[PDB]
């Protein structure tokens, strides 16, 4: 059994649209993975992966006219979790976390009641996947040459996928945590595509998680 | 002539870098020179107080010269002689400053690392140039330097037209 908790229509206000010096818009998979990680940390619930879908999204000033690129949107979240208790307690915990959580600095103002979906095999995974509808999920398409030439030629979209460590911080004067290994780092990128979750063939290719070399990845790899 | 420009660059603050947190915050002044990144078409950034720089015949400063026709890599690799290579390489020193910069936790093997993100000069300079040359317009434009581009960075000082950013807006579910 694979367990998933789904939270529909998460309305977020005041998102920091700037994810890197050259990316403005949808918060990257690192942010949602970070959200799942924080929930596991403060809830104790084991989060294996996260799939996230765009329902609504608008960068302020991009549709009509009125500093730090700010946006507002509506997301649909799906956390893969390991949970051997009743669904209700799980749902309550997730509710209480999401109520006070933040996505890329953006306040959560509203969301549907979290519900649980279970999958015995890959075929029920489709029911799980379609429980998210309607929303556009992010799938990894990888880099062919580099993000600029890929953006021009493959007409895809760059997204922060992790970081490259440049140097180890030698003096921890202004470091809030003086024990955890700290590094000066710079964003790494991949190329992503959007798909209506119902049209995604293998759900594992939209389930994001942490991985080696300071990166986030999908469970099922590059999209097919 | 470029010898004179480089020596004038050295006589002042004179720092050549490929990564900096100054793109994030004006008052940061963290500079990193990643030697692995240096290739033939690598764009490089520079700092000196108020972008003070001796100008050549056509009115270009050292930053404009170095980022034109692979000049930086040609000097760096020694094509123009060992002396110029040395003088240029003496300015490629790192400075560590974490102030005003984000400190995030990124999950490692059952543990975590702390990351202090800084920006890439090449992606900004070469990226803007490249998206310009290939008429890519699915983009936003952001200006760096704050109220004083002059004291931010040489690239910021010259490229007042702003830098290009990928528009990473997703598709949306329709109302009806």
From TrEMBL, chain A:
Organism: Vibrio phage ICP1_2011_A
InterPro entries referenced in this protein's UniProt entry, alphabetically: CRISPR-assoc_prot_Csy2
Domain of life, per lineage: Viruses
The protein, known as: Csy2
Upper lineage: Viruses, Duplodnaviria, Heunggongvirae, Uroviricota, Caudoviricetes
Pfam families on file: Cas_Csy2
TrEMBL record, chain B:
Entry superkingdom: Viruses
Protein name: Csy1
Species in which this protein is naturally found: Vibrio phage ICP1_2011_A
Upper lineage: Viruses, Duplodnaviria, Heunggongvirae, Uroviricota, Caudoviricetes
Gene expressing this chain: csy1
């Amino acid at each position: 059994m694979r367990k998933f908790i789904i939270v529909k229509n998460v309305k977020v206000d005041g998102i920091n649209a700037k994810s890197s010096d050259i990316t403005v818009g949808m918060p990257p998979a690192t942010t949602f993975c970070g959200l799942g990680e924080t929930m596991s940390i403060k809830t104790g619930i084991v989060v294996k992966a996260v799939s996230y879908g765009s329902v609504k999204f608008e960068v302020r000033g991009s549709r009509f006219n009125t500093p730090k690129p700010l946006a507002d949107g509506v997301f649909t979240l799906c956390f893969e979790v390991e949970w051997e208790d009743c669904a209700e307690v799980l749902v309550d915990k997730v509710t209480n976390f999401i109520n006070t959580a933040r996505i890329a600095g953006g306040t959560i103002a509203s969301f549907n009641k979290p519900f649980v979906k279970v999958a015995k095999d890959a075929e029920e995974l489709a029911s799980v996947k379609n429980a998210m509808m309607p929303c556009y999920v992010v799938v990894d398409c990888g880099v062919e040459v580099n993000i600029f030439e890929d953006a021009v030629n493959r007409k895809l979209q760059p997204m922060v996928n992790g970081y490259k460590k440049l140097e180890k911080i030698v003096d921890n004067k202004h470091m809030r945590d003086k024990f955890t290994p700290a590094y000066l780092a710079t964003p790494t990128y991949t190329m992503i595509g959007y798909k209506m979750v119902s049209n995604v063939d293998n759900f594992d290719q939209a389930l994001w998680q942490y991985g080696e070399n300071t990166k986030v990845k999908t469970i099922g790899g590059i999209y097919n | 002539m470029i010898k004179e420009m480089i020596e004038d660059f050295i006589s002042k603050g004179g720092l050549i870098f490929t990564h900096s947190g100054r793109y994030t915050n004006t008052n940061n002044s963290c500079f990193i020179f990643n030697k692995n990144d240096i290739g033939v078409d690598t764009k490089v950034d520079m700092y000196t107080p108020k972008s003070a720089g001796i100008k050549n015949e056509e009115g270009e400063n050292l930053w404009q010269v170095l980022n034109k026709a692979n000049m930086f890599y040609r000097i760096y690799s020694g094509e123009l002689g060992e002396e110029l290579q040395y003088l240029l390489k003496s300015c490629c020193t790192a400075k560590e400053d974490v102030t005003t910069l984000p400190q995030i936790y990124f999950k490692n093997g059952e543990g975590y690392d702390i990351l202090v993100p800084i920006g890439n000069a090449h992606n900004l300079i070469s990226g803007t140039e490249y998206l310009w040359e290939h008429k890519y317009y699915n983009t936003f434009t952001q200006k760096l330097g704050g109220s004083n581009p002059q004291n931010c960075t040489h690239a910021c000082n010259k490229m007042r037209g702003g830098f290009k950013q990928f528009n990473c807006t997703p598709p949306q579910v329709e109302d009806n």
